[PDB]
Amino acid sequence: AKSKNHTAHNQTRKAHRNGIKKPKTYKYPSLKGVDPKFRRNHKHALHGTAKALAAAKK
């Protein structure tokens, strides 16, 4: 009892009913998977410059 093995027939018809939705994009993306050494420092860096700009409201 054999039957069909494979086809892509009709597949892009379906993909286009509701999209191929463009990737979508953000100001400020995630640092996910960025160098830990960098990130560590970047932290205290930010902490500092925040603290400063806070002192700017003395």
Binding site: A15, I20, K21, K22, P23, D35
Partner: protein, 159 residues
């Protein structure tokens, strides 16, 4: 039965370019990448460590990380009816800065120019690109150029 390993199907695509085998020239390494830079991806068969999978050959992503010997590149690959994000860890031998944007950069610095050269003169800005326009009228002359009359030509066999 079937075979679909990591570098399957990549016979001529990770191949080396006629008469361009051997050491990579050193400039490949003096290049410098920063986050946000747009790079093109193209595998160097001679450098087995840190190699883009074949799907990412010919593709252009954006740096998101900089490392001792590599750049992390984010590419949006589309699977199903949608895109997902992929981060790639690539050695500098498989990446180059993309000219895909030099035009733009060229065009902006130029556009800011003739905006000052205009504005601070008395306007007539006009700095959007326009498509190839159809041809205006013109008068073609004959002096030294009378039309030569051509006909079609008989069948023949040369052999």
């Amino acid at each position: 039965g079937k075979s679909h390993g990591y570098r399957s199907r990549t016979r001529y695509m990770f191949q080396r370019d006629f008469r361009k085998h051997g050491a990579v020239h050193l400039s490949t390494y003096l290049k410098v990448y920063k986050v946000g830079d747009i790079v093109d991806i193209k595998a160097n068969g001679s450098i087995q460590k840190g190699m883009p999978h074949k799907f990412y050959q010919g593709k252009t992503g954006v740096v998101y990380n900089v490392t001792k010997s590599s750049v992390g590149v984010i590419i949006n690959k589309m699977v199903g009816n949608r895109y997902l994000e992929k981060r790639l860890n690539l050695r500098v031998e498989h990446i180059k800065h993309s000219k895909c944007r030099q035009e733009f950069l060229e065009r902006v610095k130029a556009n800011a120019a003739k905006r000052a050269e205009a504005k601070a003169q008395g306007v007539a800005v006009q700095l959007k690109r326009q498509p190839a326009q159809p041809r205006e009228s013109r008068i073609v002359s004959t002096e030294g150029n009378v039309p030569q009359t051509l006909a079609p030509v008989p069948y023949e066999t040369f052999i």
